[PDB]
Structures are given as structure tokens and as C-alpha cells.
Amino acid sequence: YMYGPGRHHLFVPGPVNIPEPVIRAMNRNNEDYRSPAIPALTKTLLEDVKKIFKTTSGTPFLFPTTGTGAWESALTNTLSPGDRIVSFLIGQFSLLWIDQQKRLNFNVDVVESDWGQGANLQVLASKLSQDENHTIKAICIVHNETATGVTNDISAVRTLLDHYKHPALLLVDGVSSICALDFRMDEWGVDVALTGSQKALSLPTGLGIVCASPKALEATKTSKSLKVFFDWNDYLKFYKLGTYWPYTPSIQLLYGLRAALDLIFEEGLENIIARHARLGKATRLAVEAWGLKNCTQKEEWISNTVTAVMVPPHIDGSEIVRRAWQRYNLSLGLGLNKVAGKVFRIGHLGNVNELQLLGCLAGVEMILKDVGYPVVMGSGVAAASTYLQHHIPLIPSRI
Amino acid sequence: YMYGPGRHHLFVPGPVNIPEPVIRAMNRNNEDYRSPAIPALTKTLLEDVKKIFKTTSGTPFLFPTTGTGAWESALTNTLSPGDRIVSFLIGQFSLLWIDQQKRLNFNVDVVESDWGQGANLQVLASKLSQDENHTIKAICIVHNETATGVTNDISAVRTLLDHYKHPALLLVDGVSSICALDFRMDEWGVDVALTGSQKALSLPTGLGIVCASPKALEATKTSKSLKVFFDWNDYLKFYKLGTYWPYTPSIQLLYGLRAALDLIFEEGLENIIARHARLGKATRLAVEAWGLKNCTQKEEWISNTVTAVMVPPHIDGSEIVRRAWQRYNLSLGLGLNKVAGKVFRIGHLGNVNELQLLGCLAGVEMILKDVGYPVVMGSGVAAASTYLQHHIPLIPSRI
Amino acid sequence: DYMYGPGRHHLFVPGPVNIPEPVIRAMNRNNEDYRSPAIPALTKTLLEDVKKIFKTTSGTPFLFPTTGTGAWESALTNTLSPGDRIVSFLIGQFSLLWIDQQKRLNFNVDVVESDWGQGANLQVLASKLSQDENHTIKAICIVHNETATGVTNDISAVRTLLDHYKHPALLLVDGVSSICALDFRMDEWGVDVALTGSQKALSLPTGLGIVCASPKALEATKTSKSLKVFFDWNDYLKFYKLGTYWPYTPSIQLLYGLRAALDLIFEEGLENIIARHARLGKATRLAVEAWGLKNCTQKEEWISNTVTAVMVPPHIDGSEIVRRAWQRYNLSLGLGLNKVAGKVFRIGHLGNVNELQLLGCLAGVEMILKDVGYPVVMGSGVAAASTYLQHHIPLIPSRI
Amino acid sequence: DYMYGPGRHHLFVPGPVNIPEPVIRAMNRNNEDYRSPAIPALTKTLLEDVKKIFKTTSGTPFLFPTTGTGAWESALTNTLSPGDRIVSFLIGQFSLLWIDQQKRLNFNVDVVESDWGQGANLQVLASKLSQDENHTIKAICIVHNETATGVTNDISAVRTLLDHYKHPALLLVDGVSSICALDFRMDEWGVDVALTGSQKALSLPTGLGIVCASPKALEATKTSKSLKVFFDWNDYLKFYKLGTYWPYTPSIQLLYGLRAALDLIFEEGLENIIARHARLGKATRLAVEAWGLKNCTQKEEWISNTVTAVMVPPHIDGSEIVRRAWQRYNLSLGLGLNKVAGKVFRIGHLGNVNELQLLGCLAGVEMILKDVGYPVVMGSGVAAASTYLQHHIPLIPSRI
Ligand SMILES: Cc1ncc(COP(=O)(O)O)c(C=O)c1O
Ligand SMILES: Cc1ncc(COP(=O)(O)O)c(C=O)c1O
Ligand SMILES: Cc1ncc(COP(=O)(O)O)c(C=O)c1O
Ligand SMILES: Cc1ncc(COP(=O)(O)O)c(C=O)c1O
Ligand SMILES: [Cl-]
Ligand SMILES: [Cl-]
């Protein structure tokens, strides 16, 4: 369409780069999803999916939908209209989840934080202490707010729920974190965890992956919200029958997920988490060398999947995004809603290595000069490469 | 996984064969859906999509979902809980749509027909005549029942509604018909028409395409059903903003749809419809030469996208499907629910030519012999090839 | 997408052939550095596995980035010197083209000619070997499978005559349209240079000319005074020793493609692949018999299970059948070449193709025969093929 | 997926190079019948468009299914006879290998040698032309861009000396690592045979050796007594007349790939591609200067915009830099070959690659230099390149 020379530099926090082996696995004609091959393939995907959530008790569902669809499935299967939810508004995507909760006629207790801050767990503790009659039925929290680069502590939420002996369900949006940050469903007692295929899993859009605890499944018996396409029970019915699929899945995405999981296990989930931590640290060091500000306001909330960069008031962050596309064949994340024009976002998420990031960072330095910001050329690249030269591990397959 | 020699013969009525040019168009890395390229691509898809529905007034929506999801979008955007619907139970998929309607708390007047018969429009006429107060808010009808190979006359439904001056909405499932059978949204006054990508469009699963009339859009103002992921209003909001996408689409399916539409227009929609008619006629001639019975009970309901073949009571149609897979590398459609074991289904839908079908038909003759049915070898192939030799047009690009 | 037609194109020429989906996937890749550690490691496994399809433990394979005609040229220039006497057999277009090349490289070719549709004249070979008391015949150049005629030669019979007369001539065999489809036993038959092309039964794109040389062939390179650089085996042998294998740049995509192709061949089983080709060839020949047409091959001992050359009656132009197949049925059939131009058309049945694919082609040919005015009985050829195949198609082991 | 590493592999060897996504898509296809009407129609357009990248209206192109070394061989055997005197210039590994081939084909090669890092010695050429009163020199064989050294020769200067002495020798130019990256003017320079390979600036897989011959070169085929069949131009010219173009099977996938590659070249613009390569080469040379290392190229008139050969100090092994790049950074750099083995490493910058890709590589090289104990100032080379590129990168026209 709008071709540019060389390889496009995709550094938005989703969709992310797809590894070549996964592209190959998806390069295939359709197949009959009622043939014996697809149920056999599906069975291996469900079992291996539990490993990336770090659950042995959870039941996964591979919905042909997006992350927004995964949201809807989590809410309508476990809750009823009028049920009271506590959720945390800290950015665009936590906001959009709350907008959805209200639109599905749930009573949402919204706990707001300034953009760049994490969930206000003190207000949470206060609301749980005062909930004698257990009216709060669920906590809905985004693990990683993609709009601001803020990661919340899920274990602290569990500590509060257990401290007050509160039975509320814990629903966690891990779209921007699972397979990039550490995520421990069982240890944290997460009841519904969800992610999307186009983030750290490094696949096309089209899978909304939902993992439910035994507690979450028992809650479906009481749930009076309406659902059909997103109903877990129809999937459970076909799991028992051995066919798994109540309606047609995407054959290509299933084989793609098989190849993505194989690559994840070959690198090692722990090594993937460490890789993201290196990339995020390197990016944050570059941002400080530029004299710019990370939108995250405290170190405890730093995000290793995206860095939201604040520019001074005379610089338009949207112009930085526009110039990256028009001149450097580079995709950067826009500042959304409240931070529109005030930030641009560097995604460091999924299948990406250090030299790819350094190319992006070098390009940002040229863009900032184009818009009149007085950056010392190479200062951010040098801060990142100096740190990375100490920590990049050798590629095991090549030792 | 379970590899077999040669090319797999995919003759289920969905998913269907993907043309090589479409496979190539989808062979690509992710892209930023907020970059200028994707809105530009999307605009051309929405405009060209209207041509296959044969609408100039309708508004299309490209949902990242399946046909079942398209169903849900059509119902929750135009109707409210408790609203009275008339629907026709004639097969598995019309049944599943009714199951969904009931699960979303609509009052469904179910008009049942025996499997192999079309919608009972006499009962419909009777119910419309008696609806003085216009309590019936919508008619939900499957255009082509994939489980039985039955095509209903949509124009007759419009004739009845107009005769009685009845304002009910007309929602039509065209998953199994659009781009294969003739479909005229505006002429028939269809208010919501929907199809899936994995049928005649010959794409992977993952797009539920919904097209709404101005009347359908006005009904959203009154609709009190709950929806977020399937809400048309959020799409309309982003159409006006010029970004089109309220959440992430599948980049690969959008480019795939662009290539699929280009191929459809190059062959010509009218020529595609005639091609399907040839394949269906050829299959029905072969079934009679075999001495077997078409499940469709009257000629007026014949389907040119799938032929449901009835076997005698001592033959297990599921064994025919099983042997096709294990020995001939051939996928045939199973008999579903009420016709389980009594039929098998030959799909002739999407991007498939005459020699492909003749290969399938020759294989069925060998399978029937394997299960003890006394078929005269070549009798069905000969009946089909004798008819096709008179009607196959020359390939225009090669004249 | 040029000259697009609906549905999948039916490729039934005897080369290039259909590529299995997994092989297409394997080649769907960016370039890689051929001097990086990955490519030598990959090449190592291909050379060892390629020996299996030749059925040799003695031979040394070479994966030339070239076509079948280039493999021809390397076979000749590495083992022979100008003026060397060669015995070759003209039985069709491709045995003719090899002989044309032999002459153009200034070899003294003794041409043993047969009618098109017949195999090599071994009685004439015997007398020539019997008269060659001073061993002036340096090589026998014979095509294993003549793709223009559908004729397969008995390679073991040539080795028998060579051994009977105690003649030391090298045995150079073109197996472009036979290896991995017909049985081929390099060591058992004492073949000194065997060659094939990637776009035939291997079911790959064009671009690899695969040559396998016996120790005697390698010994012959020491006395060979023909000129060669691109096709020189010694350059490959040197880089084999060095461990990097490639004296110049190979096709990265074809190396990975060949890896996937060999994996599929070993999964199905080579003996099972040979049997599958036997089924397809017999089914096709039965269809031809049912149609009332004639096989170009004149005797049963010469029938080819990779291609069938069909002779049409005098009032039909075989080229019209090929054109009609392309213009109306999205079907590719082989033309009659040179001597048999217009008198025949060719149905290729080799590589990764199954029985229902072939039956679709055969059904299409019946419709074409009707188009061009041949009084075919519709279904007669399909019924003969299906009646036979319903008895012999094995169950797919992967599906129990 | 062998020896897998995270993220995208950074391919910065000077061949094979990165393939544009649309070209990968174009080659993602099953085989087709090369005797069907589609392939000749496609080939027709490729031959006419290929002339544009050579900047010739007189020349005849040939798309051989071979590598650069095969294009070499065809250039020689079609225009020269054994014993013919050739003047060639040994300035690096690939000019050396061509000379090695010239000798092995029994030509009388007059070798004009220069130190690695220097261009062709034209003063010696002048004296040789001046002494050749009887026109015994039949051809000048010169490499346009020596990929082993990063040295570009002035082809127009050779034509000037040829015309000054009124010498009729043919001008054979290797443009494997120059055409579609550096400027190349076949007609203006009077080049008689120009050749390139697909895996270089054309940004395709290996498998096409593209040769373009002037009318004088074609006239020379009439007197050429070198032996050739696979590489013979006359076989192609005959099928050109017949309208089918191919004397043997081509690679279907590479034909469609070349179609897409040429479409991309015309869309960006050839002059814009030449300018882009100039930017990448200058940026790389600036980085090298900032690092305190030396360019192997000894004079500014010889600098190459397709590859930079970097000389390392005596306490560093250049091969260790290449190994480290592969083992830790998923980066492919070029080795120093033969004479400059261990003394240099090579950064390739040609084909479909943009500035941010190069800058990522340059940033990686700085980290490698630190690993092997070179006192590099982190960011110094990136800053020099970025400071220059921020001035010269053009806006992408497709994006207004
Ligand atoms: C944290 C988070 N949740 C939810 C979403 C919505 O996902 P999708 O666009 O796939 O609907 C996103 C964005 O992709 C996200 O970053
Ligand atoms: C007529 C009809 N409607 C609806 C559906 C359901 O579509 P999907 O499987 O994509 O959810 C099908 C089957 O695909 C169908 O044939
Ligand atoms: C038996 C035989 N030998 C040689 C050749 C020539 O091979 P290629 O076209 O790959 O150069 C062919 C044609 O494919 C052939 O069938
Ligand atoms: C200038 C030059 N000439 C010739 C060659 C040899 O070409 P090939 O490796 O494709 O045979 C090369 C290497 O690519 C080269 O760089
Ligand atoms: Cl042929
Ligand atoms: Cl090189």
C-alpha cells in the first residue's frame, strides 16, 4: 500500500513482531475443524497454555476474538447484572474495561489514579474492610496499563483479600503482561486471567485466551448475565465430547499458537521475562539520557513491556509519531486520551532483540532533533548499549 | 500432524479452500492498526463489501469474530429482551441460532419444519395476519441451511411482510450463501444480512461480516439489549473519526479480504453464482446416478452450496466420512444431530473448480463400495461430467 | 496471479510437479548467511540423507545450484576428456538433448537409436561391447526414464552386459524423472554417476541439480581433461574437507526446502512412494485402455510409472487437447515433443500427488476428448482406474 | 528454525541480502508449467524491464538459472576461444576467483595485480594497450565492485583508455555487488557483457545469474570456439525467436520473485536506490572513522557504497568479531577472506535495507568492539552516522 524501503520498525505495544517460524506455520490452507487432527492439536494447546499462566488448576479457553472480547467473556460468565465490582481507572485500557463493565449493567466502584500511577490499593483496603456483607463480588484490575507503562502488584491485591477474609473474585487483565512479565495465576489466586494473541505471544490478532480457576467455574452456576458466543459452558460441553470446538476456530491461528508456544519453551519463559526486563531497563536509561521523563511516577510501577515518554509542553508527541512513520519507517505508540500529545510510547514487547531496539532508539534521537528538541546525538543509544553490553546472554543454541 | 500424500481434498461446507493469491496476501508480519495505511485499506473494504451484499444503503461492519458472533451482533443491536421474534427451525444451524435467541431472553415463535424442508411461510403468513398490534419485532431466517442443503426464498418473506404492512425487521443468515447464491439486500429489504469469512469468501475463519440497513440502524436507538464488543455504535464512532477500529483487528485478514474481493470481482459475482450452480447440479446428478437420495425434499429448496446425501438405513453415513479421511485424504461433511448417521454432506462452496469436484465424486464411489453399497463405478462421475462438458465456460483470461 | 482461473490449477505435466504444502512453508524464509554455522550443519545432514534416495553408501553427492541439464554437463566434464568415445541411446527428446550436449562438448558419441516408444537397444550395445577389445568405449550414457515417451530402461540389464563382457566403461544414468518415483539402486547396479533434478519426484522448485558419484567416477576425475569450473567436483570436495561445503553461494530457500522434502519422503517411506507411483501409472494406463487410445510405449517391459504418453487417432491434434485443458479446465498436460508432436499428449503422474487428484485429471481428459470430437464413453476410464485403485489404495498410517 | 535466536536476525553480510516481504510473498507459490502460456508472457516483461537496471537499450539479457560464478563462466565461453589473451585485475578474493576460472578455462590471462584495498591499476592497463599493436588482447575482465575489499573501480575510465588507444577489446564487467546499488551505465560505458547475481542488490534468493550482452558481444559468439551447452546463449536466442524463451526448465518462483523485485525497484526509483546506498555507505564509513578504525579502501576514489571492509588493530582477530556477532547479538557480518583473513571484518549495506536497520547494526558493532577489548566510546559511531543521516534521509513519498 504505502511501501517504504527496508523492514518496517514496529515498536507499538501491540500488535507486535511475529517470528518468522510462526509466519511459516500459519502459511496454510484451511482444514476441516471436525477432522481428528484439529482436536488432537487443540488438546496440546490447552495443556501447554496453562504453563504460561503458571496454573495447574485453571481451565483455558481459546476464544476467536480480541482482548476486548476476552474482557466480556470474563465478566458475563462469573457475574450477574447489578453485581458490585471494584476496578481501578489508571489509564486508557483500564478505563475502557470500566466503560464495558458499566455498559453490561454492573455496579462499578471506580478507584481512580492519576495517569502514571498504579492502582490505589489503600482505597481498596478501605473498601474491603467496610464490606461486612460481602457485597463486592469481584476485583477487576489491569496488570499492565499499556497507555502509561504502569505495572500493578497483583500479589498485593491477594494479600488484601486474604487479610480481610474477603471472597471476591480476582479478574486480571494480562493482555499486556503475560509471556513478558512474570504472571502466577495459582500463587496469586487469580480467578480469571486473560491475554490477547497480538501482544507478547507475538501472533496475529484473533485469539482471546481466557483461563478460569475452579472458583471462577463454580461462579458460572450463579451467573445470570447473558452470553452465548462467550459462554464457557458450551466450550466445556465440547471438551468432554472430545471435539473441543462449539463453533469454527481459526485453523491458521491454532497452528500459529503451536509454533509460538514451541518457541517460547525453547527460549524459556524465565529467559523471555529477563529479556523484556533488559529491553525496558535499556529504554528507561535512554529516556533519562535524553533529559525526558518517564510517565511512570514511581519505580515500583515500572513496566518492562512499554515505556511512555513525556515530552516538554512545546513538543507535540503526536508529531513525533507522525514523523517516525513518514520519514523513518518506524511505528511508535500514540499518547491516548488524557495523555494525548503529551507522550509517545516505545513498545518493547514480544519477539524483539537488543539491536532492533537500539535501531528504534537511534531513530527517536533523530526525530527529536527534527522537532527542535536539543538531544545530544548518541547519548541515549550509548546509555542503553553500555548497559546491555553487560547483560545480553549468549544464544544457547549457538554456544 | 497426520500427514497424507498429495493435496488434501477439502469438501466440507466450511471452512473452504483458500485461493493461493489470498494465502500470499496473508503471508505478512503484523502492522500498526493506528498507522495511516490500515484506515485507508479499511475504507476500500467497506465500500467493496457492499457490492457482494448488493446494497447501496447498507452499512457494513467487519467484526473480528465468527458467524456465531455475527448472529449475536445482529440480535443485540436491533432488539430488546422480551421482544417477540419469529424464526424457522429447519436444521442444525437454524436450530443453533434459535438456541442463541432464547439464551439472550427473546420470545421466539419457533416455526418448525422437517429436516430437508424449507421454512414454512404459510405459518408465517398466518402469524403476520394475526399480529394486529405489531408485537413481532423481527423475522430471523437462515437463507441456506448448511446441515440439510436447503435454500429458502427470502423474496417471499418480503412479499408477506409488505402484503400485511408489517414493520418487522428482516434478519437473514447468509453465512452459507453470500458470494455463492444470489443475495439482494436492498431488493429483498433485508435489514441485517451477515456472512462468515470461511465460507464462499474463501478466507480463514475470523471475520463476521454484518451489513445493516438504515432501518436496522434506527432500531439501535430503541435497542435495550446489552452489548459492547458487538456494539455497532462504537464502530460508527470510529468510522466518523476516520480510524474505523474501536479495537485491534486482524491485519492479515484485512489484506486477505482485499485479495479475496479482488479475485471475486475479476471472476465476476454473476459468474461465481453460475459456477456454484453448475457444481451443485453436477453433484445432484451424480447422487441420483448412485441411486441415493438428496435430503432436500422439493426442487424449490435445492442448495448450490452443499448437497446432503441420504444413505439407506444399513449404511452409516459417519463411516463414509471416516473412511474418506483415513484412506482417500478427503474431508466430507458429517450428518448433524437429527440426520446424524443418516446423511453425509458434499460441500461445493467457494474457490473450487469442476475437476476438483469430479475427484471428490470419484472418491465417494470408491468409499460407497468399501461400505458394501452396490454402486456402478463411474456412473456418478459420468453423469456429472456429461452435464458439465456442456456448460463449463472458457477461462476469459486465457482466450 | 497471471491468467487467473477459478479453483486450484491441476498440474499434470511430468515436471515441474506439485510442491507439498510443508515444503512451501519451509522455503518461506528470508535469506541467511551461507558462511554462518547454521548452513554447513544443515548441508551436512542433506548430503547424508540424499545418499539414501540414491540407495548408495559408496557415492558422494553434490547439490549443484543448477537444473537437470546442468547436472548432465557436470557428469560429462568431470569424468571424460574431449575425443572420448561414449555410447548413448536416442529414444526420445531428452535422450536426444543429452546426446546433442555430448557432441557439443566434443565427445565421440556412438549413437544407438530406437523408435520413439521403444527402450534402449541392448542387443546393439552387446555387439559394440563385444567388438571393443581395446576398451575404447569410456562411458555408457543412458536415460533411465525418457519423459518424452514414457519409457523406462532396465539399468540392471546394462550392468549385466557390462559385466558379462568384462568391460570397464563408466555407467552414467540420467534419473531426472525416475529417482524417488521409480526404484533406483546405485550401488547394486554399479552406477558411476547418477543425477536427478529437484523439480521432479523430489517435488521441489527448479534449482538443484543433484549428482552422485561412485568412487570409480571420482577416480576418473584425475584423468579428465574436459574443462570445468562451475561444475567442477573438486571445488566441492575441497570445501567438504574444510567443513563449509559451499565453494559459492547456494540457495538458502532450496536447502531448507530439500530438508523438508526429504523428511516427508522418509515419513511416507521410499518403498511406499515407489508403490504409490505404480498405482498411479497403472490407473492411468487402464484409463487410456478404456478410452480406446494407445500407449506410446510399445512393450510392457518399458512402461513408465512417472508419465504416460497417449497416442491420439489421426483426426485429432494432441496439441489441441493440451490447449483445451488449459483454456477451459485449468489443467496442465504435457505436449508431444519433436517427432511425436501433435501425435501424443502426456499425463504426468509423479511427485506428491494422490489418487483423487489423478482421478480428477482423468475425468477432465474424458471431457476434453469429447470436446475435440473423440467418441469417448464418459466415465469409462474413471471406472477402470477407480475399480483398480479401490483394491490397492493403502490406509494412511498417520490416521491409523 | 535451526540455531534459533530471539528477535529478527540482522543480516549484514554483502550477499545474500534481505528479501523484501512482498518478494517473499510473490515466491510463495506452487510450481507451474513452464511451457504454459503464462510463463512466456511473464518472461517477456522481465527481459524488457531487466534492460532498464543495466541502463541499456542495445543489450540482450539472459536469465540463467545459476549463481554469479555461473554468469562468469557464460560470459567467458560465449565470447572467447581457448588461448585468447585476457587482461584482468587481481585486487581481492572475487577478482581472484574470476581469474582462477579464466585460467582453468585455458585462457591466456594477463594479470594486473594490486594490493588489497586498492583499485585496478589503470596505468599498467594503458601501457599494455599501447604495446598491443596487433590487437592480441581480446577482452578486459574487470570486477566493478570487489566485495572482499570494499573497492569500486571506474568503469568509464577503462572505456576511456580503450577508446584513446583505439583498441577493440571486449569489456566484460562483473557487477554482482554493484548493479541496482551503484550506478551502472552499460551503453554509455560500452560494456559488452555485464552480469549480476540475484542474491545481491536485487534482494532475491540465490539462483539467477543475469547476463546482458551487447551487439558486439553477440557478434563475438560467431568466432568463439570455447565449449558450452548449459551456458550457451544461442540456445536462449533460438527460444526467444520461437516465443517460448526457455531451452530448459526455469525456477517458476524466482521468475515471479524477480517480477515483484523489479516492481519495487521501479516504485522507489533506481536513482533513489543509488542515493540510498550512498547514504548507508557514508554513514557506515563515518561510524568507522569515529571508532578510530580504518577503512580497507586506501583512496576516496575507490570507496564502495555496498560494503565496508574494516581493518582492526593487531591485537584483535576480526574473525572473533564475526563469531561474537553471531553468538551473542544475532548479527551476521562478513569475514575477511584469504589475504585479509583476521585483519578485517565486513559490514554489508546493500539491497532492501533502511537507515534504522543499519544504525541497529552499528550500535551492535560498538558493543562487540567492547567485548573483544577495543576502547570504543559507546555511541560515538552511531552519533556520527545519525548526525549525517538526520540531514539526508528523504521523506517516504508514499506517505506524502
Ligand atoms: C491491557 C490491554 N487490555 C485490553 C486491550 C484490548 O485488546 P484488543 O485490542 O485485542 O481488543 C489492550 C490493547 O490491545 C490492552 O493493552
Ligand atoms: C448457515 C450458518 N450459520 C452460522 C454458522 C456458524 O458459523 P461459525 O462456525 O463461523 O460460528 C454456520 C457454520 O459455519 C452456518 O453454516
Ligand atoms: C529425463 C530428463 N532429463 C533431463 C531433463 C532436463 O532437465 P532440466 O529441465 O531441469 O534442465 C529433463 C526435463 O526436465 C528430463 O525429463
Ligand atoms: C563481485 C562478486 N563476483 C562474483 C561472486 C560469486 O557469485 P556467486 O556466489 O553467486 O556464485 C560474488 C559473490 O557473491 C561477488 O561478490
Ligand atoms: Cl517434459
Ligand atoms: Cl562475500
Other CB atoms within a 10 A radius of the CB of residue B51 amount to 13
Grid cell of B222 as nine digits: 430503541
The residue whose CA has the least distance to atom 3 of ligand 1 is: A175
Task: Tell me the β-bridge partners of D61.
Answer: D212
Distance (Å, whole) CA B16 – CA B242: 33
Looking at the structure, tell me whether residues A65 and A99 fall in a common domain.
yes
Pairing state of beta strands A169-173 and A150-151? unpaired
Q: Does A184 carry a binding-site annotation?
A: no
Q: Which helix (H) or strand (E) holds A136?
A: strand A136-142
Set of chain B residues whose Cβ sits within 8 Å of the Cβ of C371:
389
Distance A250 CA to ligand 1 centre (A): 20
B208, burial (CB in 10 Å: exposed 0-12, middle 13-18, buried 19+): buried
Separation in Å, CA of D366 to nearest CA in chain C: 21
Distance A153 CA to ligand 1 centre (A): 19
- Record: contact B205-A37, CB cut-off 8 A: no
Residues A197, B206: contact at Cβ < 8 Å? no
Q: Ligand 1 pocket, B32 CB below 6 A?
A: no
Distance D246 CA to ligand 3 centre (A): 12
Grid cell of B371 as nine digits: 461400505
Set of chain A residues whose Cβ sits within 8 Å of the Cβ of D378:
381-382, 385-386, 389
Distance (Å, whole) CA B258 – CA B260: 6
Q: Which ligand neighbours the alpha carbon of D92 most closely?
A: 4
> What are the φ and ψ backbone dihedral angles of B217, each rounded to 5 degrees?
-70, -40
Distance (Å, whole) CA B14 – CA B306: 10
Cα B148 to the chain's mean position, in Å? Answer: 13
Q: What is the dihedral of CA B40, B46, B48, B54, to 10 degrees?
A: -170
Distance (Å, whole) CA C236 – CA C251: 15
Looking at the structure, tell me whether residues A158 and A207 fall in a common domain.
yes
Separation in Å, CA of D128 to nearest CA in chain C: 28
> What are the φ and ψ backbone dihedral angles of A245, each rounded to 5 degrees?
-110, 110
* Chosen domain end from A268, A299, A332: A268
Question: Which residues, in sequence order, are CB contacts of C54 under 8 Å at separation 6+?
Answer: C61, C179, C184, C186, C194, C212
The owner of cell 430503541 is: B222
Other CB atoms within a 10 A radius of the CB of residue C205 amount to 29
Looking at the structure, tell me whether residues A230 and A372 fall in a common domain.
no
Sign of CA dihedral B344, B350, B354, B356: negative
Distance (Å, whole) CA A189 – CA A154: 9
Half-sphere exposure of C148 (CA within 13 A, CB side): 21
Residues D278, D305: contact at Cβ < 8 Å? yes
Cα D132 to the chain's mean position, in Å? Answer: 31
- Calculate the alpha carbon distances from C99 to B315, C96, C336 in Å: 60, 5, 19
Distance (Å, whole) CA A327 – CA A305: 25
Set of chain B residues whose Cβ sits within 8 Å of the Cβ of C328:
392-395
Other CB atoms within a 10 A radius of the CB of residue C271 amount to 9
Other CB atoms within a 10 A radius of the CB of residue C341 amount to 13
Q: Ligand 1 pocket, B135 CB below 6 A?
A: no
Distance (Å, whole) CA D299 – CA D283: 17
Grid cell of A343 as nine digits: 507522550
Looking at the structure, tell me whether residues C164 and C209 fall in a common domain.
yes
Distance (Å, whole) CA D385 – CA B72: 56
Taking the CA of residue A66 as reference, the ligand 1 atom at the shortest distance is: 10
Breaks in chain A after residues (C–N exceeding 2.5 Å):
none
- Record: contact A228-B17, CB cut-off 8 A: no
The residue whose CA has the least distance to atom 8 of ligand 1 is: A67
Domain residues for B104?
1-268
Looking at the structure, tell me whether residues C293 and C353 fall in a common domain.
yes
Which residue in C31, C228, C331 has the most chain D C-beta atoms within 10 A of its own C-beta, making it the best mutation to test that interface?
C31
Pairing state of beta strands B330-334 and B9-11? parallel
Distance (Å, whole) CA C79 – CA C223: 8
SS3 B47: helix
- Record: contact D37-C3, CB cut-off 8 A: yes
Distance (Å, whole) CA D215 – CA B35: 50
Distance (Å, whole) CA A161 – CA A169: 9
Q: Which helix (H) or strand (E) holds B154?
A: helix B154-163
Of C250, C62, C230, the C-alpha closest to D73 is: C230
Grid cell of B218 as nine digits: 434506527
Taking the CA of residue C147 as reference, the ligand 3 atom at the shortest distance is: 16
Distance (Å, whole) CA A145 – CA A305: 10
Of D13, D1, D35, D45, the C-alpha closest to D199 is: D13
What method was applied to determine this entry? Answer: X-ray
Other CB atoms within a 10 A radius of the CB of residue D183 amount to 17
Distance (Å, whole) CA B162 – CA B168: 10
Question: Do you find a cis peptide bond into B19, omega within 30 degrees of 0?
Answer: no
Q: Resolution in angstroms for this experimental structure? A: 2.2
Of A235, A234, A67, A250, the C-alpha closest to B197 is: A250
- Record: contact D32-C24, CB cut-off 8 A: no
The owner of cell 563382457 is: C165
Q: Which ligand neighbours the alpha carbon of A246 most closely?
A: 2
- Record: contact D66-C68, CB cut-off 8 A: no
Residues A132, A164: contact at Cβ < 8 Å? no
Q: Ligand 1 pocket, A175 CB below 6 A?
A: yes
Of D284, D294, D296, the C-alpha closest to D358 is: D284
Distance (Å, whole) CA A176 – CA A144: 6
- Record: contact D335-C34, CB cut-off 8 A: no
Buried b (16+ CB within 10 A) or exposed e, C255-264: bbbbbbbbeb
Buried b (16+ CB within 10 A) or exposed e, D350-376: bbbbbbbbbbbbbbbbbbbbbbbebeb
Task: Give, to the nearest 10 degrees, the angle between helix C380-392 and helix C355-371.
Answer: 170
Q: Which helix (H) or strand (E) holds C358?
A: helix C355-371
Looking at the structure, tell me whether residues B70 and B181 fall in a common domain.
yes
Q: Which ligand neighbours the alpha carbon of D66 most closely?
A: 4
Distance (Å, whole) CA D227 – CA C105: 6
**Chains with at least 3 CB pairs less than 8 angstroms from chain C:** A, B, D
Which residue in A26, A273, A353 has the most chain D C-beta atoms within 10 A of its own C-beta, making it the best mutation to test that interface?
A353
Which letter does DSSP use for residue B119 in this model? -
**Chains with at least 3 CB pairs less than 8 angstroms from chain A:** B, C, D
Of D204, D190, D313, the C-alpha closest to D259 is: D204
* Chosen domain end from D269, D288, D308: D269
Set of chain D residues whose Cβ sits within 8 Å of the Cβ of A20:
1, 8
Biggest CA–CA distance in chain A, Å, is 65
Q: What is the dihedral of CA B128, B134, B138, B142, to 10 degrees?
A: 0
Distance (Å, whole) CA D135 – CA D165: 11
Other CB atoms within a 10 A radius of the CB of residue A82 amount to 10
Q: Ligand 3 pocket, C191 CB below 6 A?
A: no
Distance (Å, whole) CA B181 – CA B142: 13
Set of chain A residues whose Cβ sits within 8 Å of the Cβ of B250:
204-206
Looking at the structure, tell me whether residues A323 and A240 fall in a common domain.
no
SS3 C323: helix
Q: Which of C13, C37, C229 lies closest to D104 in CB terms?
A: C229
Distance B174 CA to ligand 2 centre (A): 9
> What are the φ and ψ backbone dihedral angles of B43, each rounded to 5 degrees?
-60, -40
Other CB atoms within a 10 A radius of the CB of residue B59 amount to 18
Distance (Å, whole) CA B3 – CA B327: 12
Taking the CA of residue A69 as reference, the ligand 1 atom at the shortest distance is: 11
Grid cell of C337 as nine digits: 515433443
Separation in Å, CA of C73 to nearest CA in chain D: 7
Question: Do you find a cis peptide bond into D40, omega within 30 degrees of 0?
Answer: no
Residues A147, A308: contact at Cβ < 8 Å? yes
Read off the amino acid at residue C300.
E
Q: Ligand 3 pocket, C329 CB below 6 A?
A: no
Grid cell of A180 as nine digits: 513478558
Question: Do you find a cis peptide bond into C16, omega within 30 degrees of 0?
Answer: yes
Distance (Å, whole) CA A376 – CA C55: 66
Distance C254 CA to ligand 3 centre (A): 18
Distance (Å, whole) CA C379 – CA B66: 41
Set of chain B residues whose Cβ sits within 8 Å of the Cβ of A231:
103
Task: Tell me the β-bridge partners of C352.
Answer: none
Q: What is the dihedral of CA A175, A178, A182, A183, to 10 degrees?
A: 80
Taking the CA of residue B145 as reference, the ligand 2 atom at the shortest distance is: 1
Separation in Å, CA of D251 to nearest CA in chain A: 21
Biggest CA–CA distance in chain B, Å, is 65
Looking at the structure, tell me whether residues A322 and A259 fall in a common domain.
no
Of A66, C309, C188, the C-alpha closest to B69 is: A66
Distance B47 CA to ligand 1 centre (A): 27
Read off the amino acid at residue D31.
N
Q: Does A298 carry a binding-site annotation?
A: no
Count of domains in chain A?
2
Distance (Å, whole) CA A281 – CA B268: 55
**Residue ranges of E strands in chain D:** 10-12, 60-64, 85-90, 108-113, 137-143, 145-146, 151-152, 170-174, 193-197, 209-213, 294-295, 307-311, 331-335, 344-348
Grid cell of B330 as nine digits: 478427503
Taking the CA of residue D97 as reference, the ligand 4 atom at the shortest distance is: 4
Distance (Å, whole) CA D19 – CA A270: 33
Distance (Å, whole) CA C390 – CA C387: 5
In chain D, count H helices and then E strands: 14, 14
Q: Does A198 carry a binding-site annotation?
A: yes
Of D322, D10, D391, D6, the C-alpha closest to A9 is: D10
Separation in Å, CA of D340 to nearest CA in chain A: 26
Distance (Å, whole) CA D361 – CA D288: 12
Of B363, B365, B356, the C-alpha closest to B388 is: B356
Looking at the structure, tell me whether residues A36 and A79 fall in a common domain.
yes
| Residues making up the binding site of D for 3-hydroxypyruvate | 200, 346
Grid cell of C356 as nine digits: 483423487
SS3 B220: helix
Sheet holding C209-213, edge to edge: C60-64, C209-213, C193-197, C170-174, C137-143, C85-90, C108-113
* Chosen domain end from B215, B249, B268: B268
Looking at the structure, tell me whether residues C22 and C76 fall in a common domain.
yes
Taking the CA of residue A14 as reference, the ligand 1 atom at the shortest distance is: 14
Looking at the structure, tell me whether residues D168 and D293 fall in a common domain.
no
Task: Tell me the β-bridge partners of D215.
Answer: none
Looking at the structure, tell me whether residues C260 and C184 fall in a common domain.
yes
